[PDB]
Amino acid sequence: PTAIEHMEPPFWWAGMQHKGLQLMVHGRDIGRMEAALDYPGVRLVSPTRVPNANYLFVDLEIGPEAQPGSFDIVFKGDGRSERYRYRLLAREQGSAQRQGFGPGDAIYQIMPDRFANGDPSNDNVAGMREQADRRHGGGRHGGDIRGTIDHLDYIAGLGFTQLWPTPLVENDAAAYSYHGYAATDHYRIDPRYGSNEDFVRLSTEARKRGMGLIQDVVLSHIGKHHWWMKDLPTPDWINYGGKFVPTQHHRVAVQDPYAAQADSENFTKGWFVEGMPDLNQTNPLVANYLIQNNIWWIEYAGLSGLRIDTYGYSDGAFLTEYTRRLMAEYPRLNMVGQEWSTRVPVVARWQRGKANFDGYTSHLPSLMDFPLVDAMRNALSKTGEENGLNEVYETLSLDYLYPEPQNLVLFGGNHDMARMFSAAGEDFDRWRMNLVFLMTMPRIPQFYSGDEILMTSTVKGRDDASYRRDFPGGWAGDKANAFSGAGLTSQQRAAQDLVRKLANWRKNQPVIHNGRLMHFGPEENTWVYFRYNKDKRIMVAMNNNDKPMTLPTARFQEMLKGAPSGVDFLSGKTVGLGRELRLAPKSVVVIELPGLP
Amino acid sequence: PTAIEHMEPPFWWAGMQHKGLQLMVHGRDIGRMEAALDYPGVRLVSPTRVPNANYLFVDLEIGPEAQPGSFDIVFKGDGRSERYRYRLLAREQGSAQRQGFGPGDAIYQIMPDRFANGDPSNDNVAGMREQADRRHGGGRHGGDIRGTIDHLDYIAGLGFTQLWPTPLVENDAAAYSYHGYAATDHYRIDPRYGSNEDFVRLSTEARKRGMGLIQDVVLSHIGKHHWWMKDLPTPDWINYGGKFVPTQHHRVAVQDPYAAQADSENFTKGWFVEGMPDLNQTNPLVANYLIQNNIWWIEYAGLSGLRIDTYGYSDGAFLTEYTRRLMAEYPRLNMVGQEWSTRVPVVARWQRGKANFDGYTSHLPSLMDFPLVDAMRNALSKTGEENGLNEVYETLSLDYLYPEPQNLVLFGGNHDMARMFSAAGEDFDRWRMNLVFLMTMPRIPQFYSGDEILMTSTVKGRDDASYRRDFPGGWAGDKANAFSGAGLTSQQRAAQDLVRKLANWRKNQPVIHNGRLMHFGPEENTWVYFRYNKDKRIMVAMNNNDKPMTLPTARFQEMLKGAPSGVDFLSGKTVGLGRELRLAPKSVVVIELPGLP
């Protein structure tokens, strides 16, 4: 091997919250060397060696007096000497104070390979392990950053204010590289998507259109083709000494009074799959590496926040420190952890401010609301149940378990589950109820690309490829183009219109962002709730039955306070409320009313 | 009425914790009288007069200097004078400190009408509204206290240490009087069961056999034929002015940050059914009445605790005071609330010691563990699921939500749900798993009469009559008789023998009463857990599959610590533990090992 092959992070910033910076330097016999530097405000701590002669960790303390600039780090040993020009950048104005995504936002989720192919020429890149195959469900289809940039106006036009793409970091695998969840280089965009600079441009172009950029970060694991695997930095870098030992996924084991250490360790150290080596985050070098890398992306790419994969599969103590570090840099940031459980207590455990039985503490601002999504999908699909919506109501009543339920991400769907329209049984009227719910709950809504034109999938079991079909219009030659509206059916277009109507309306509804919620127990699969404050009331009523239903309004008087009627935002019709609310079969109304004193 | 028709409570005790005693006096124009008395230590408080001429509430303060004895309360008015000789009983030594049922106990549950007809002559009682009909599923079959007493040896012989009969208080209804849940006289045993004195004798006879007696109390409602209903003590004694307004059962509404007052009021004030007038517990006279009545039963009948029906259907503030009052009198008592929800947070809300988001405080020691019973019934029934036992494991992991999870009552079944054997799909092997689970969990186990001989029922929905078939041997002429063994199949006898073996064994296993629990995440519907302390380990392993399973024992070494083998208590077979645990199809083993160092 040659010179310095990797320097990570490759540059940094003056004026960060945490003064320490740990450089991970890789190259043949770099560990046999001694580093030296001279720059006011930067102090070189002095080596703690690792047995591997091919890695050197350099500990810097960057004082508040250190100014933007650059300086040489010089490595000397065995009659030779190596050099790296290290840059400390100036931070953009307002960087530390950046506002993360919140209740007023709506997030549009894409898989960058499956959204838009702006440049067919990067579909394959010389030297990489996988060839593109649009006809393979698990293959690379060729979506890229150029295609995403091309369609930012579309996403903004739909009413979305944040973009969350699944990971774009290099995944140089021989197969299943497209999904991004097995990083082979945490400091590089996969060249098939574009360059590091292209990703920065994506952020800047999104910001021009009023949209934030949320990065999808994996912390627990990497891909087996990561360059580390060819020469392990330390013998304990990867859990189980770099050998495949599978997790059995006992997620409660990390938060269970009756847990076996075997099960907790298996959850946090066990390999997700054979092709995903598990990072030993109990090694402080690994912890520092991940914390610094994610900060580096936030700072470099001007992100509004993060979505954190496989949340509890990382070491718990590491997550405590990681969340503390990120949030100390960016106190107004949001980060949404993916803790995939339908049990509210299991999700709620991880949110900042939670008083946990075991004293577990976290600075994680948000989690994905799998419990509530599961409840609504059940309600809308099990149409033979007398009162399926009761599950939604009862799940929501558990919100007190969360320190900040209003900061949780509620979603129509995502790349891991059945398509929203399919989960609703291809029932457009019931799908409308799901959409209304998503846009009116005291949550941060997230929507999955393609759902706005009722893309379908298999509903039973798990079928990842079926959830990730190419967006129509993302590829040259497509017969239908959802970006332009060309070739959409009337129902598809009606869906897209409704999404655009509701999401744009929602942006302008402070009562949804921070108003109160009062809901009523569902009765025979009818459900009424209100968002309210002194300025506005929004009354949602849904009739989840294939028959008309009539609801006496006396029941709702603490919210209605004698309102004789209101205008339904959906239909534009005036709806009577004096003595009863008459719902047509499978209907939902969104009645807008004056404030509640 | 004839002078004083009802005096309630009819007598009291010297030396109670709460000095106050409120007498509810009933009779024609008694409300027009004025009470007077002269007895050392007893003070008459100045009157508070309700507009109903047929009732008088008399407030006494019984100071600690009041001795046991009697004194006349004289009621003077309109030139007439009525007397009542009031008695203060001496309390039994150790009364206040009585030990309530706890984790070392096992509760046997009966319905008195359905267990044993010791006296056919009381099946009908002249004057009563219902005639017995043994062939009618919802009729009175004639079981009584004499029959229960006749068979205490049998219950004690099975290994049970507490008897819980469903209510024996008067239910003088035209139809469905048998079940006891619609009281028509809170101070009287239904004469078809026997007298008040017979109930005291049931308690004393049970005690002679090492068994406590747990009374089933209804607080929220009475029956429509209660004598109150003919002449309402106050206009607000019954919720909704004594007229039927149904509850819609929105149980979470009393513990939901988004609750409507309409829903929460409807839950606690709404009538359970038309035949069950709802008590207005916000009226302090109603509150005092119930508190005193239940204390009266505890003191009079020498009870070891209570089972409290329809728990959250009572007023929340009333419940705080009721539980406070009862626990003040009897600090070591146990009372188990029936809060029928399969959601851990909903049940846990009510247990003494819980820190609730809304500051709600309760003194209730115990609740019925519907969530865990539901989880195990799901695991045993969902035979098409690869790992249904995962529900049990995850539910258990939520025990940190309860202040005192070991004090919760775990049950094989009860009078409101499908028969335990039917719940296991009539699979003897799965039934054994449920039984072992019940007898080894950190819980107070409760068992439903008839389950020890594998009685069956319908499985779906609610079918009360199906769960409540006459105990075989309870009636003269029965051709299957569980008391003698006559007519039982080999399998039914084996069930009975196993109940006896495990219950009696449990009695002598402190490690089950107060030991730790460590469980392991179930894998492919195999599950291993341990009860352990310095003295003993008890390993439970179950294979919920119709194929053999081989579990490497490395996994369990934090509990096994190299144990080469053990003896299965159940089969009495030796079980290898050195390298692998071989489980036969549908097996459960229970292995005793010495305590860990």
Ligand SMILES: OC[C@H]1O[C@@H]2O[C@H]3[C@H](O)[C@@H](O)[C@@H](O[C@H]4[C@H](O)[C@@H](O)[C@@H](O[C@H]5[C@H](O)[C@@H](O)[C@@H](O[C@H]6[C@H](O)[C@@H](O)[C@@H](O[C@H]7[C@H](O)[C@@H](O)[C@@H](O[C@H]8[C@H](O)[C@@H](O)[C@@H](O[C@H]9[C@H](O)[C@@H](O)[C@@H](O[C@H]1[C@H](O)[C@H]2O)O[C@@H]9CO)O[C@@H]8CO)O[C@@H]7CO)O[C@@H]6CO)O[C@@H]5CO)O[C@@H]4CO)O[C@@H]3CO
């Ligand atoms: O970065 C890795 C991935 O992380 C992220 O998502 C993961 C979550 O963090 C993690 O918790 C977990 O979620 C599970 C959740 O916790 C569970 O409660 C449960 O929820 C329900 C589930 O959704 C239902 O489908 C069902 O589960 C059963 C299912 O019906 C049944 O078919 C079977 O599933 C087995 C598959 O059939 C089998 O093929 C294989 O799965 C493969 C998969 O086919 C393959 O494509 C590959 O997956 C890739 C994936 O495409 C990538 O995107 C990347 O995934 C990341 C996610 O995108 C993140 O968001 O990497 C993956 C790994 O390479 O590999 C899979 C693994 O072999 O095995 C399956 C079983 O082992 O059985 C299941 C039950 O076991 O019912 C559940 C109701 O309780 O399941 C959640 C997952 O669906 O997993 C997330 C990754 O999916």
Ligand SMILES: OC[C@H]1O[C@@H]2O[C@H]3[C@H](O)[C@@H](O)[C@@H](O[C@H]4[C@H](O)[C@@H](O)[C@@H](O[C@H]5[C@H](O)[C@@H](O)[C@@H](O[C@H]6[C@H](O)[C@@H](O)[C@@H](O[C@H]7[C@H](O)[C@@H](O)[C@@H](O[C@H]8[C@H](O)[C@@H](O)[C@@H](O[C@H]9[C@H](O)[C@@H](O)[C@@H](O[C@H]1[C@H](O)[C@H]2O)O[C@@H]9CO)O[C@@H]8CO)O[C@@H]7CO)O[C@@H]6CO)O[C@@H]5CO)O[C@@H]4CO)O[C@@H]3CO
């Ligand atoms: O003291 C009263 C009883 O209290 C104790 O148990 C009750 C629990 O505290 C309470 O939480 C709830 O528990 C669960 C319930 O058992 C489950 O069924 C289920 O309930 C939901 C159900 O799944 C839904 O379908 C719906 O139920 C409605 C139902 O669909 C609808 O038809 C109607 O119900 C009527 C019946 O269908 C009809 O037959 C008749 O009922 C008769 C009954 O057949 C007869 O035996 C007699 O019932 C007695 C009972 O036998 C007594 O033992 C006593 O019950 C107490 C329990 O034993 C306690 O342990 O009193 C009963 C009389 O009230 O008389 C009945 C009335 O004539 O009429 C029914 C009523 O119209 O309406 C229901 C309700 O809307 O919603 C259910 C709630 O969401 O899950 C519940 C908890 O989640 O009820 C327990 C009693 O079953």
Ligand SMILES: [Ca+2]
């Ligand atoms: Ca491309």
Ligand SMILES: [Ca+2]
């Ligand atoms: Ca891990």
Ligand SMILES: [Ca+2]
């Ligand atoms: Ca009888």
Ligand SMILES: [Ca+2]
């Ligand atoms: Ca009530």
